[PDB]
Amino acid sequence: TRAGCLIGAEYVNNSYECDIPIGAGICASYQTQTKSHGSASSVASQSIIA
């Protein structure tokens, strides 16, 4: 992103409010995803989503 290189976070096409401002129009948060249909708390990747 224009701010820079983000590691450990996955991009989300949806739009939530900003919790932790990453910069350049990007914000990150800690999210638990049950949409994966497997393990909710332990998602397939790092739980940080931008």
Add this chain to the structure above:
Amino acid sequence: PIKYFGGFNFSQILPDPSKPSKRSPIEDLLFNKVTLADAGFIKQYGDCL
């Protein structure tokens, strides 16, 4: 979707759908004038490579 407000023409201040930055014509003029240091657009300012 329509932009008639009794005759008060806000075209110069409302966003321009026919542009990529979607700035208003007055906003476009202002961004073009103040360009001594800022490039006026962020096409390449994101990475500066």
